[PDB]
Amino acid sequence: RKPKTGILMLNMGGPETLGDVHDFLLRLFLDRDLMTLPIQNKLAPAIAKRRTPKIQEQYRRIGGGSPIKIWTSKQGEGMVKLLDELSPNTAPHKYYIGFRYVHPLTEEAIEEMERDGLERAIAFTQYPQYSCSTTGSSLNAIYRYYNQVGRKPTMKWSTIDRWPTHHLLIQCFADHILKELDHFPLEKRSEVVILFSAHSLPMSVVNRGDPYPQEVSATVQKVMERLEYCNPYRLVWQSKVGPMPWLGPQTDESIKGLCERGRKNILLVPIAFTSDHIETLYELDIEYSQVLAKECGVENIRRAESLNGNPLFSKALADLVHSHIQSNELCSKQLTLSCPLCVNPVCRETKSFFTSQQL
Amino acid sequence: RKPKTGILMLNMGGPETLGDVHDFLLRLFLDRDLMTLPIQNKLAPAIAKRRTPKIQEQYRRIGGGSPIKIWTSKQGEGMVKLLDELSPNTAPHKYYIGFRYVHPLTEEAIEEMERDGLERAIAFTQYPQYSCSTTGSSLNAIYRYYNQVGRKPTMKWSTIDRWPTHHLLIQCFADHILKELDHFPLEKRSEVVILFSAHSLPMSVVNRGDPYPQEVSATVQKVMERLEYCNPYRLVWQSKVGPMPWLGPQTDESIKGLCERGRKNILLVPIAFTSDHIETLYELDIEYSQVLAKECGVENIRRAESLNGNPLFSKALADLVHSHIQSNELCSKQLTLSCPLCVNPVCRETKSFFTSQQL
Numbered sequence: 252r253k254p255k256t257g258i259l260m261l262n263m264g265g266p267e268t269l270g271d272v273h274d275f276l277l278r279l280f281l282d283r284d285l286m287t288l289p290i291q292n293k294l295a296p297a298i299a300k301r302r303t304p305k306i307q308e309q310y311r312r313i314g315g316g317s318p319i320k321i322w323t324s325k326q327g328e329g330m331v332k333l334l335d336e337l338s339p340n341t342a343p344h345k346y347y348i349g350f351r352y353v354h355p356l357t358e359e360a361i362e363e364m365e366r367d368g369l370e371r372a373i374a375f376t377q378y379p380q381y382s383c384s385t386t387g388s389s390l391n392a393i394y395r396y397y398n399q400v401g402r403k404p405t406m407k408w409s410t411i412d413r414w415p416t417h418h419l420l421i422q423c424f425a426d427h428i429l430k431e432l433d434h435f436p437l438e439k440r441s442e443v444v445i446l447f448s449a450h451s452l453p454m455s456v457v458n459r460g461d462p463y464p465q466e467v468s469a470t471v472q473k474v475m476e477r478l479e480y481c482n483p484y485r486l487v488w489q490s491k492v493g494p495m496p497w498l499g500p501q502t503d504e505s506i507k508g509l510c511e512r513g514r515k516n517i518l519l520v521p522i523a524f525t526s527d528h529i530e531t532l533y534e535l536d537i538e539y540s541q542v543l544a545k546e547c548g549v550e551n552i553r554r555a556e557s558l559n560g561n562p563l564f565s566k567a568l569a570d571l572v573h574s575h576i577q578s579n580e581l582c583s584k585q586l587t588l589s590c591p592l593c594v595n596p597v598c599r600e601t602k603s604f605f606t607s608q609q610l
Numbered sequence: 611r612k613p614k615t616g617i618l619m620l621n622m623g624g625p626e627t628l629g630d631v632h633d634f635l636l637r638l639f640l641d642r643d644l645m646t647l648p649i650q651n652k653l654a655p656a657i658a659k660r661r662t663p664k665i666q667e668q669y670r671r672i673g674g675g676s677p678i679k680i681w682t683s684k685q686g687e688g689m690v691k692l693l694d695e696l697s698p699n700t701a702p703h704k705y706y707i708g709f710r711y712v713h714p715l716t717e718e719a720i721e722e723m724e725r726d727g728l729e730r731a732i733a734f735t736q737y738p739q740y741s742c743s744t745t746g747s748s749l750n751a752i753y754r755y756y757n758q759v760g761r762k763p764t765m766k767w768s769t770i771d772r773w774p775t776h777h778l779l780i781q782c783f784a785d786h787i788l789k790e791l792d793h794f795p796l797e798k799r800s801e802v803v804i805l806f807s808a809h810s811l812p813m814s815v816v817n818r819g820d821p822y823p824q825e826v827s828a829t830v831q832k833v834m835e836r837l838e839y840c841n842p843y844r845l846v847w848q849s850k851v852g853p854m855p856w857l858g859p860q861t862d863e864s865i866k867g868l869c870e871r872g873r874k875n876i877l878l879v880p881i882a883f884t885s886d887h888i889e890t891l892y893e894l895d896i897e898y899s900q901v902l903a904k905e906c907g908v909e910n911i912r913r914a915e916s917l918n919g920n921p922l923f924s925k926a927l928a929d930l931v932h933s934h935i936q937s938n939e940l941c942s943k944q945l946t947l948s949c950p951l952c953v954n955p956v957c958r959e960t961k962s963f964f965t966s967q968q969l
């Protein structure tokens with residue numbers, strides 16, 4: 252039976268092999284929803300070529316590529332299997348991967364969905380917390396695709412554009428934290444400090460009204476409530492690049508600082524992505540946990556497992572899609588308010604693209 | 611009957627009359643738990659003198675003084691009345707006001723609690739969200755007081771050091787929001803944008819690990835959940851001082867930005883203080899809602915009522931104290947973790963002062 256409902260899973264993606272690194276960086280530096288540069292068509296390929304060796308070396312250090320596509324596929328398969336049973340009236344469901352910067356690209360996915368002759372398409376961001384740099388850019392890509400192709404969609408669109416507090420997402424995080432706490436020496440368990448770590452944003456983005464830091468904070472509070480405040484925590488921010496101001500405190504500085512202050516038993520929790528990727532596998536596991544932590548005299552540093560293949564996680568995904576379908580919503584109320592200092596003309600067009608959909 | 615349990619309500623306070631402005635600012639610029647200045651004992655008097663006229667003029671514009679003490683007293687009286695019935699084994703209860711920068715000073719309150727011959731003293735911060743600049747400074751004052759008099763306390767101490775998501779606090783905010791939405795023209799209600807406004811922090815404080823922005827964000831999310839996401843929102847940060855980087859976006863710029871982008875129906879919600887004070891009555895009500903709003907072409911700008919004398923709020927205070935007593939807690943789990951980059955030696959001493967209490 253040919254698919255009726257398509258679920259477009261949106262994420263930035265990551266290079267699957269070392270050879271994919273250059274083009275990943277090229278698309279990233281070309282993305283005007285992420286950043287603007289002078290002579291950008293000329294300077295993007297230059298930054299790409301320059302930064303490829305360094306990024307290739309990071310991927311080499313974790314086994315030679317990003318597991319993002321593997322994990323997304325596994326999650327998508329599990330989601331669809333559940334959706335066919337939850338929602339027989341919208342079945343068969345099919346998932347499509349729409350990566351922003353690697354194949355399959357958002358635009359390739361839309362093309363395939365349109366060729367597949369779907370009745371309905373759901374833009375399902377894989378970032379639980381909304382940033383204009385992440386979910387916003389992916390949704391802008393969908394608007395721009397139709398705008399540049401010069402045709403209206405042949406399917407009904409809607410979006411699940413954020414889900415920072417979904418009950419089953421919270422349960423998955425709390426489960427993975429509890430199981431990692433079990434791996435500390437018993438005598439250190441109550442002394443463990445939890446560092447929730449989410450990718451940082453430049454202050455220029457924070458200061459224009461980006462919703463992300465507040466939503467990430469909300470996920471943290473729900474997880475800690477579920478854990479009954481069993482250990483103390485901070486929310487800290489990783490992987491700032493370059494010399495400009497970004498939102499801190501930095502995850503690396505925090506680890507060092509805790510160690511210097513006698514807090515030598517630390518649990519890292521990636522709170523803003525749902526699968527392993529370069530920043531858990533390289534940055535947290537290698538750079539912070541193996542190198543820095545050792546230099547600083549840590550006693551025990553561990554990282555909670557990414558959600559990856561947890562069946563409760565694909566259950567959260569299917570629950571979200573099913574509730575979205577049942578509610579008839581086209582997007583969250585939050586999407587209807589652009590950043591107070593948004594200077595990107597496309598964000599309003601994208602918002603309208605979703606709110607104006609037939610149905 | 612002589613009081614058994616003292617509830618020390620901690621708040622920065624504000625000058626009750628125009629003549630109180632100078633000493634208020636003197637104490638604030640002298641506070642080493644708030645800020646670090648070279649030759650601070652010498653510089654603080656010069657800073658206070660310079661800024662007194664500007665601050666006096668703000669207070670004149672709102673009727674000549676701060677209502678903080680009035681609202682604190684009312685809230686304290688209602689709390690005590692409830693506590694005498696909720697907790698007869700710790701009754702009679704007495705509230706004491708400990709303002710950081712005006713009379714009655716934290717130190718004067720402690721002196722009076724000790725003279726009153728209490729069995730138990732609860733340091734009850736009136737800031738629901740913990741910052742080291744606010745609650746931390748007030749709790750540090752308590753430790754420093756005993757350190758300076760060179761005497762141990764004659765009463766058992768404990769602290770309610772944060773309460774960002776207390777269910778009755780959330781219900782009060784949501785209630786006041788719904789009440790204010792009812793005052794917009796009916797035809798604009800769904801179009802209203804909610805701007806949660808909390809005092810900003812300097813980025814130097816944010817970047818050392820201050821807990822405040824994440825706890826404020828948690829209060830915001832719980833209110834919006836209770837409101838069923840009826841209107842879109844942002845959390846924005848008010849009244850940065852001086853030229854250094856502070857956490858944004860700023861409330862004033864956001865108001866201007868929203869107006870410029872066609873969002874002309876705005877509800878301001880003070881989310882991080884529980885009574886009116888100079889920044890609601892002057893900054894929000896006059897500077898932003900009267901002057902800025904008019905300049906930008908606003909259609910409707912309103913501000914949700916501060917919690918003030920709401921009886922449900924007194925009930926929240928009493929339920930917090932009651933739970934704290936029943937739990938036997940000495941402080942939150944969060945207080946047992948100092949900021950990862952804390953450089954104030956008193957924070958650890960204060961933390962130990964509470965965690966080490968007999969009982």
Ligand code: FDE
Pocket residue numbers: 264265266279285286302306317382384385450451452453456463492528529530
């Ligand atoms: C502006 C901005 C904003 C943002 C945001 C964000 C969020 C929320 C999350 C995120 C993430 C990320 N990133 Fe992000 N971001 C950005 C950016 C960027 C850049 C520029 C890059 C590249 C880096 C280098 O080193 O080159 C990135 C990058 C990034 C990454 C990595 C990728 C690879 O290498 O593979 C990740 C994972 N990012 N992110």
Ligand code: FDE
Pocket residue numbers: 623624625638644645661665676741743744809810811812815822851887888889
């Ligand atoms: C560093 C820092 C931090 C902080 C924080 C905070 C929070 C959380 C809250 C707050 C608040 C406040 N403040 Fe705050 N803060 C600060 C500061 C400050 C200063 C310097 C001042 C004074 C200003 C002037 O103008 O002079 C203030 C200030 C302030 C105020 C006012 C007072 C009067 O006038 O009365 C208020 C209400 N603060 N805050």
Ligand SMILES: C[C@H](CCC(=O)O)[C@H]1CC[C@H]2[C@@H]3[C@H](O)C[C@@H]4C[C@H](O)CC[C@]4(C)[C@H]3C[C@H](O)[C@]12C
Pocket residue numbers: 267268313314315316317318527532
């Ligand atoms: C990084 C990740 C392992 C995650 C983990 O063990 O925690 C692994 C799992 C499967 C791996 C990939 C698959 O084994 C297939 C490829 C095998 C090649 O030898 C290298 C690239 C290659 C594309 C792999 C790169 C990387 O090692 C992957 C993506």
Ligand SMILES: C[C@H](CCC(=O)O)[C@H]1CC[C@H]2[C@@H]3[C@H](O)C[C@@H]4C[C@H](O)CC[C@]4(C)[C@H]3C[C@H](O)[C@]12C
Pocket residue numbers: 286287298301302453455492493494495
């Ligand atoms: C780190 C990299 C330097 C490339 C190189 O010379 O190797 C530079 C090139 C362009 C920079 C970005 C662009 O200037 C646009 C953004 C501007 C913000 O002020 C900081 C983040 C911001 C996203 C920058 C981060 C970083 O400094 C980048 C990515």
Ligand SMILES: C[C@H](CCC(=O)O)[C@H]1CC[C@H]2[C@@H]3[C@H](O)C[C@@H]4C[C@H](O)CC[C@]4(C)[C@H]3C[C@H](O)[C@]12C
Pocket residue numbers: 626627672673674675676677886891
């Ligand atoms: C600003 C506040 C009113 C807040 C509001 O409008 O809700 C009012 C309420 C009661 C007022 C105070 C009281 O009326 C008593 C004093 C009267 C004097 O004429 C001025 C200072 C004085 C100490 C007042 C200052 C200020 O106008 C107060 C504090």
Ligand SMILES: C[C@H](CCC(=O)O)[C@H]1CC[C@H]2[C@@H]3[C@H](O)C[C@@H]4C[C@H](O)CC[C@]4(C)[C@H]3C[C@H](O)[C@]12C
Pocket residue numbers: 645646647657660661812814851852853854855
């Ligand atoms: C506003 C005032 C300037 C006095 C004047 O000339 O009017 C200055 C004097 C001391 C300053 C503060 C101190 O330098 C300490 C803090 C330093 C942080 O980087 C910013 C906030 C911070 C709290 C400063 C804010 C503001 O710039 C202050 C308060």
Ligand code: FES
Pocket residue numbers: 383387460461588589590593594595598599
């Ligand atoms: S940058 Fe946030 S809506 Fe445009």
Ligand code: FES
Pocket residue numbers: 742746818819820947948949952953954957958
């Ligand atoms: S500055 Fe936060 S604990 Fe000392």
